[PDB]
Design a protein around this ligand. Structure first.
Ligand code: HEM
Ligand code: HEM
Ligand SMILES: CNCCc1cccc(OCc2ccc3ccc(N)nc3c2)c1
Ligand SMILES: CNCCc1cccc(OCc2ccc3ccc(N)nc3c2)c1
Ligand SMILES: [Cl-]
Ligand SMILES: [Cl-]
Lengths: 362, 362
């Protein structure tokens, strides 16, 4: 059964992958080899070419991602060789440095050994490799509420945060055979952060806002031809609205709109003044300006949607079905100013792809 | 078959309606009477109470409507007695006057005789009773592009627009047995319009924008207990974003964002300046301000979403399933600033309800 599903997924992936790589003639013999490997071993091992192309296909098939035009330039790092926690740490440190690239962000994925019997070899606890801690006790809220449960789990393990609003969480992961994860503080020299200033409004710096340069999502599973890479952190560059309309704006995140309204000099008293909307726009302008000024890659939602339109055109021209999740593709500010809002998308799930998986804490 | 569907819909509607009206004991005898009427006549006639409550249920079940908290206060006008085109005209004129109510808009529906054998008794051609004409010829675009086909159909019939950007379309409808519709110019004394000014930016009036006071949607079909009221125009008051983020903003409508950017004194050259977003906010602030200043009812999207949350709570408390269309419920500006964005909704279709129907032109 288990063995059956794997073979099926393998046939479908190898056929499609080799077709796109112009290697269609090599399919029959590769499939032969795979069949034997599965019979003999219970699993099979991707070639470097298969793994690289699979990770790229998986990004291409990510319905919720507006940034897919660049799927084929994904930088894929093969770390299936790691066996120790020092190696995993160093690979994660390396991913941060190489993806950051002094501000000129390279979309990158680092791929660790896959689940074996559904048994994880490496289990990453972080949601993103770089993220801020959150605390909630005695009515006191500090940092990022979205990080409260992971922060509490880290502190169970002997980590202690300084309780600023921007404590960097340690890297935290567990190896097969260890009962507990280990944690490592991030070297601050590896982590680019951007202070938020406004191009016109000088008081904006009074808010003392900042955000980190690179979102490196580290808790999703990459599935390629029936092989489950549960540990495979990847990154792009930010779209500005993720920071300005959600991370810094949401009431359940940093909740900064009233403070923004105050520093930009507008009242926050009447819904009809659209003060939240006006605050959102200025905060989002501040975020784009600040990343650009520091030389850290970022895309605004208009440019991003323009790129996505080209992705749609490229899909059509290549003869591939396009899939998408309208509810995630539309940006959270001025969505009707983008073409995405005015059409519909088929939300079918195509593999390879990235999937959610259960958290090991909570 | 036809006769069967009707009876089924009737049983389900009468049972639910009388239950809500505390008239459950009267169901058995009412259903008896209806059964006979259908056998004998092919159809059945709603009581005033059934019709009124059915139209209210239909609004309550409109998945795409954010304004549903007020479903039970719908003003229902029963015009099943009309037989002539002068009567239809006068009923439509009356609806405009009574709904407008000197600016204090009353949500109202005027209900005309229903389809008989699927044969319409009255066929309204207008999308809304009050709307602006649109023209497109020789590269010249004037008025509302959304009105181009209806405008062309009106001019086929001897109507002629002045070719301002805001020509009011005539009322246009067809009676059973007439080969052609008739048209009647709207008396300007019945139509409230609001000039768009900005609370802070005096130059905003240079754009010479205006919009009409009351959206009176006149091309949907009301279905109640298997009876098809294809002619049943209804209105609420506007939510400001419908005018400011769509009618005046969309590239395929009045397309005013570049002109807005110019009068508010910002460049429209770089996506990263978020000039479209900033223009959207100021235009939307202008719209709310202008309606309020003139004493014409309007709701902003924050207040509207707050009302909708109460509608959700009321549904739960009354033991009714809530249905909704997330993609239409979210406002087109700052959607993530509303609770709607952060939850999901079951998009099941429950009857009574309002439905699309084929246009008689195009
Ligand atoms: C190159 C720059 C990129 C940009 C600007 C971009 C933009 C975005 C945005 C805005 C979202 C929505 C996230 C949210 O609202 O929570 C998203 C979702 C997503 N992106 Fe991308 N992305 C990029 C690169 C990548 C890469 C390199 C991958 C993987 C190889 C990826 C895979 C995804 C996935 C899987 C999701 C959905 C996650 C979920 O379901 O929660 N993206 N992207
Ligand atoms: C009282 C004020 C009301 C407000 C503020 C309101 C608000 C809205 C808004 C903003 C939409 C979305 C329209 C679009 O984006 O194209 C909508 C859709 C709708 N509303 Fe309401 N509404 C109100 C009253 C009513 C009334 C009185 C009815 C009928 C009795 C109604 C039935 C509907 C229906 C059927 C739709 C969907 C139409 C379609 O599918 O195209 N609403 N409403
Ligand atoms: C706001 N939704 C949070 C829930 C959630 C859970 C797990 C992963 C996840 O990823 C969002 C995500 C994923 C990949 C991205 C790549 C680039 C980018 N700019 N944003 C990206 C954002 C998001
Ligand atoms: C933007 N969608 C246009 C397509 C379309 C076709 C037919 C009817 C229709 O109604 C939108 C609609 C319906 C009822 C409304 C009631 C009140 C209100 N403020 N807006 C309302 C808006 C909309
Ligand atoms: Cl993020
Ligand atoms: Cl409208």
């Amino acid at each position: 059964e288990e063995k059956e599903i794997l073979w099926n997924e393998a046939k479908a992936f190898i056929a499609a992958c080799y077709q796109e790589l112009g290697k269609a003639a090599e399919v029959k013999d590769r499939l032969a080899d795979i069949k034997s490997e599965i019979d003999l071993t219970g699993s099979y091992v991707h070639t470097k070419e298969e793994l690289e192309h699979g990770a790229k296909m998986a990004w291409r098939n990510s319905n919720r991602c507006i940034g897919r035009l660049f799927w084929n330039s994904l930088n894929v790092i093969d770390r299936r060789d790691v066996r120790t926690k020092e190696e995993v740490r160093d690979a994660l440190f390396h991913h941060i440095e190489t993806a950051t690239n002094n501000g000129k962000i390279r979309p990158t994925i680092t791929i660790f050994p896959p689940e074996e019997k559904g048994e994880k070899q490496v289990e990453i606890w972080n949601h993103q490799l770089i993220r801020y801690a959150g605390y909630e006790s005695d009515g006191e809220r500090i940092g990022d509420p979205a990080s409260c449960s992971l922060t509490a789990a880290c502190e169970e393990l002997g980590w202690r945060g300084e309780r600023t609003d921007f404590d960097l969480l340690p890297l935290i992961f567990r190896m097969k055979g260890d009962e507990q994860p280990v944690w490592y503080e991030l070297p601050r020299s590896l982590v680019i952060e951007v202070p938020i200033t406004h191009p016109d409004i000088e008081a904006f710096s009074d808010l003392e806002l900042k955000w980190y340069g690179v979102p490196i999502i580290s808790d999703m599973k990459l599935e390629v031809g029936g092989i489950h890479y549960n540990a495979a952190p990847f990154n792009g560059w930010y779209m500005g609205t993720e920071i300005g309309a959600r991370n810094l704006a949401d009431e359940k995140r940093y909740d900064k709109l009233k403070k923004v309204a105050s520093v930009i000099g507008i009242a926050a008293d009447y819904n009809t003044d659209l003060w939240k909307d006006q605050a959102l726009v200025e905060l989002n302008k501040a975020v784009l300006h600040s990343y650009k000024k520091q030389g850290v890659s970022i895309v605004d939602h208009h440019t991003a949607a323009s790129q996505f339109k080209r992705f749609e055109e490229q899909a059509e021209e290549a003869g591939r079905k396009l899939t998408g999740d309208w509810t995630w593709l539309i940006p959270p500010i001025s969505p009707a100013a983008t073409h995405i809002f005015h059409r519909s998308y088929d939300n079918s799930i195509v593999k390879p792809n990235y999937f959610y998986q259960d958290k090991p804490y909570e």
